[PDB]
Amino acid sequence: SERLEPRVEEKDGYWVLKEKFRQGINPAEKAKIEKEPMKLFMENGIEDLAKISLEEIEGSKLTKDDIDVRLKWLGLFHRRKHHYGRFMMRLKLPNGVTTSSQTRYLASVIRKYGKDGCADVTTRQNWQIRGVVLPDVPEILKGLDEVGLTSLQSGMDNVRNPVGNPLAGIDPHEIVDTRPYTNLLSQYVTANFRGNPAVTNLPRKWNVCVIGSHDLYEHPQINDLAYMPATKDGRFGFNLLVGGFFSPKRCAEAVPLDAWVPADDVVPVCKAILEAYRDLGTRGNRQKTRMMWLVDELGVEGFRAEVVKRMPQQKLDRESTEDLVQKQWERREYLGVHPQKQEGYSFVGLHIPVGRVQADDMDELARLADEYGSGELRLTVEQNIIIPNVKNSKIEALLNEPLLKNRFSTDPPILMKNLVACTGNQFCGKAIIETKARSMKITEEVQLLVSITQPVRMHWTGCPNSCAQVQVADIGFMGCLTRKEGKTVEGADVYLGGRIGSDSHLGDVYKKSVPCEDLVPIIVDLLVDNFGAVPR
Numbered sequence: 001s002e003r004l005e006p007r008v009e010e011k012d013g014y015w016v017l018k019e020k021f022r023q024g025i026n027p028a029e030k031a032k033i034e035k036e037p038m039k040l041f042m043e044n045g046i047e048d049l050a051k052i053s054l055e056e057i058e059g060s061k062l063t064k065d066d067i068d069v070r071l072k073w074l075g076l077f078h079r080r081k082h083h084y085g086r087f088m089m090r091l092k093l094p095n096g097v098t099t100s101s102q103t104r105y106l107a108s109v110i111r112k113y114g115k116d117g118c119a120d121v122t123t124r125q126n127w128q129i130r131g132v133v134l135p136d137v138p139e140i141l142k143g144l145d146e147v148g149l150t151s152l153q154s155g156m157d158n159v160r161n162p163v164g165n166p167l168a169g170i171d172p173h174e175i176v177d178t179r180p181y182t183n184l185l186s187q188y189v190t191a192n193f194r195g196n197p198a199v200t201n202l203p204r205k206w207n208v209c210v211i212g213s214h215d216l217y218e219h220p221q222i223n224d225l226a227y228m229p230a231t232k233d234g235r236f237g238f239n240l241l242v243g244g245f246f247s248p249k250r251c252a253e254a255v256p257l258d259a260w261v262p263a264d265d266v267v268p269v270c271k272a273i274l275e276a277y278r279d280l281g282t283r284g285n286r287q288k289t290r291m292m293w294l295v296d297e298l299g300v301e302g303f304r305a306e307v308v309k310r311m312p313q314q315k316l317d318r319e320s321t322e323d324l325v326q327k328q329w330e331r332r333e334y335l336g337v338h339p340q341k342q343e344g345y346s347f348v349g350l351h352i353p354v355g356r357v358q359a360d361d362m363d364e365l366a367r368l369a370d371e372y373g374s375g376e377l378r379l380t381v382e383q384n385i386i387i388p389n390v391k392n393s394k395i396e397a398l399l400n401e402p403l404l405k406n407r408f409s410t411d412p413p414i415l416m417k418n419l420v421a422c423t424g425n426q427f428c429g430k431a432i433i434e435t436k437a438r439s440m441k442i443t444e445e446v447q448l449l450v451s452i453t454q455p456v457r458m459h460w461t462g463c464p465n466s467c468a469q470v471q472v473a474d475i476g477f478m479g480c481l482t483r484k485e486g487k488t489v490e491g492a493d494v495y496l497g498g499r500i501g502s503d504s505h506l507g508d509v510y511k512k513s514v515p516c517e518d519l520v521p522i523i524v525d526l527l528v529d530n531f532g533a534v535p536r
């Protein structure tokens with residue numbers, strides 16, 4: 001069979017598209033062919049690239065592709081359009097678990113760039129830092145490694161940050177601690193921080209998550225692979241869901257693979273699915289390359305059969321009938337102070353306004369973690385931060401800290417609690433609109449106008465990529481250009497009725513291309529009409 005012949009092959013320890021499969025391939029594919037991105041790290045190609053001047057780099061397609069494309073395999077994103085010559089940098093941070101000494105190291109990096117530095121918590125409970133310049137990269141990379149961090153394979157056609165339960169290990173109601181799994185996935189994916197070329201040539205990005213909570217903080221429905229906790233014949237394992245994605249062209253919720261694996265087949269099955277997708281995924285139209293297109297093209301039974309054959313021992317159990325997720329569970333709030341599983345300890349959830357932090361904030365967060373916590377922080381997919389492991393006797397002193405007074409509140413105004421916003425055009429070259437500052441301003445004006453009790457989830461995304469996941473929001477805003485009074489302005493498509501949890505739903509467009517200046521009255525009506533709000 002032509003179709004089921006692997007499109008890529010091992011060639012000198014990297015994985016390259018065969019000469020017979022070059023028909024109709026997209027620009028990303030061409031770039032990957034012209035040079036294996038992983039050589040930048042694995043043959044220390046970065047050390048040489050970091051010395052070439054910026055305009056020497058710009059003079060050739062190969063080196064300009066190195067900086068604009070291949071460097072994303074090392075977690076480095078050139079902000080060509082909004083931050084020319086500087087790089088955002090993005091980690092692996094499985095489960096969102098960071099240390100105070102990681103957080104201090106990142107602060108020391110972004111501090112070098114003064115006002116060209118800052119950082120962000122992301123919608124995959126991850127750190128990004130900003131302001132990085134190419135000559136600093138080899139030392140930054142060494143410095144990440146010293147504090148137990150990697151930035152490998154965090155952008156482009158790679159396995160993205162493994163998402164788990166932000167309360168793993170400390171949650172009194174958790175189903176299973178997700179940390180050992182998200183950690184093993186990340187370790188497998190980066191070959192213990194060395195780089196793993198076997199999984200670095202996918203037809204597109206690939207999101208993985210491990211569910212350990214009844215709340216489904218992990219968003220299984222919108223991941224390429226979701227691991228759902230489930231017993232089979234008295235053994236603990238996971239039912240598998242595949243193909244969930246957001247793109248400008250199409251969104252899909254994850255579907256059952258009709259498969260169950262035992263606890264220690266988590267890595268083997270990740271491997272088998274990744275390998276099936278690598279080998280078989282389409283590499284033409286870039287907008288038909290997400291794994292769900294393969295699942296549709298072969299059918300799920302057809303895709304499933306390709307997973308079986310790449311399993312050790314050719315075996316993949318059928319789905320277990322009854323999973324461990326309580327179908328009727330009210331999602332818990334984690335902002336504020338909450339009892340932990342461990343007696344006499346609490347976790348404290350801090351509101352990070354649209355996930356943006358400065359060097360000083362980071363150093364302060366790291367100190368508060370040491371002084372009051374266990375030197376650990378838990379990042380969340382709503383772009384917030386929890387300090388876990390606070391002895392109850394220390395809470396009151398923590399509560400008085402200027403950081404919690406002036407920047408990161410345990411008790412933000414209702415509408416701010418759950419406000420999520422993607423990078424936007426401050427730095428994102430693909431953005432049509434400014435998100436972070438504007439969303440805060442519009443929400444501040446909105447709350448001044450309403451009494452509301454329900455903690456409405458509001459998501460602001462800068463373009464149709466939907467990195468801020470507007471299709472799961474109660475009200476979502478997707479950046480577009482529109483017309484005001486003849487002038488071309490920043491506007492938004494307004495989404496309604498996305499749901500998260502067990503009864504999840506993708507919302508659809510409520511109103512098209514609304515000028516952003518006209519958003520407040522529309523949002524108030526939407527709050528008043530759908531979410532229990534009472535006017536002025």
Ligand code: SRM
Binds near residue numbers: 077121160244423427
């Ligand atoms: C930082 C983050 C948004 C945020 O403010 O939190 C982000 C921002 C970027 N995303 Fe994303 N994505 C973010 C997670 C998401 C998610 C949410 C999720 O994963 O649950 C989605 C939708 C779910 C999904 O992927 O299926 C997502 C959809 C994408 C897409 C659409 C991919 C597609 O199939 O079309 C792109 C465009 C692309 O890859 O070609 C995009 C591409 C980008 C780039 C790399 C665009 C670029 O070339 O500059 C953004 C970098 C901007 C910057 O400077 O930060 N990003 N992006 C998230 C970082 C996640 C992480 O730490 O790894």
Ligand code: SF4
Binds near residue numbers: 424463465468
């Ligand atoms: S949704 Fe668009 S503007 Fe926002 S981070 Fe993603 S690519 Fe950039």
Ligand SMILES: [Cl-]
Binds near residue numbers: 072155156
């Ligand atoms: Cl990318």
Ligand SMILES: [Cl-]
Binds near residue numbers: 080081429
């Ligand atoms: Cl750009």
Ligand SMILES: [K+]
Binds near residue numbers: 352353354383419420
């Ligand atoms: K936030």
